[PDB]
Design an enzyme around this catalytic site. Structure first.
Site: not given
Ligand SMILES: CC(C)CN(C[C@@H](O)[C@H](Cc1ccccc1)NC(=O)O[C@H]1CO[C@H]2OCC[C@H]21)S(=O)(=O)c1ccc2nc(NC3CCN(C4CCCC4)CC3)sc2c1
Lengths: 99, 99
Positions: B25-27
């Protein structure tokens, strides 16, 4: 190019007359952009991350330019704290992880 | 290896003799694992994502073998929806983004 991960992999993206900074995010299935009033049809959706779900607006077939590379696809718009370029667009610009 | 992004970049990790699947996870700045037991001292921490903030336990200097590559660093444990390998360990295994 090659992007190391010492710092957040932020890059310039363009969507219309908006240039923005966005995270190249291999952990994101979908692309989630900060609030912007894009034209055209959209559908409500809820997407989940670390601390729970946020409500977003799903816009389809939006052209987006990422580091000068062309992409077009689904963009989710809502109250994310960071603009996130997810795998749906990363694959279109030819992005891989290498180690 | 080279990892494409048509599917989630899930790899097997070895931590404390246990095999888990984790998302490259690069984010993510930090590495966050689902609730599990780890030995040694830890400290309460909070981290924010999409959806808000969660409470985690911060363990320092934890060895993890990620897809055959050794890392030793900080591992956060808490209510993440998926095990995530963040930049703190991605940098240790020499991971870059390329396009
Ligand atoms: C946690 C990870 C599994 C997913 N995250 C990306 C992540 O890189 C996030 C990116 C981030 C970065 C900063 C702030 C906020 C976020 N970073 C993060 O949380 O990092 C934390 C850990 O270290 C710290 O440094 C950075 C924050 C802290 S997410 O931003 O919440 C994210 C992004 C796109 C996305 N698309 C979806 N589509 C789909 C929808 C449909 N469903 C299915 C469809 C039918 C049933 C389910 C699958 C998923 S669901 C989904 C969730």
């Amino acid at each position: 190019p090659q992007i190391t991960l010492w710092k957040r992999p932020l890059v310039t993206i363009r969507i219309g007359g908006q240039l923005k900074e966005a995270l190249l995010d291999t952990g994101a299935d979908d692309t989630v952009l900060e609030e912007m009033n894009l034209p055209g049809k959209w559908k409500p959706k809820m997407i989940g991350g670390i601390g729970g779900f946020i409500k977003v607006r799903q816009y389809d077939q939006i052209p987006i330019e990422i580091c000068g590379h062309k992409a077009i696809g689904t963009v989710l718009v809502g109250p994310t704290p960071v603009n996130i370029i997810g795998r749906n667009l990363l694959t279109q610009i030819g992005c891989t992880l290498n180690f």
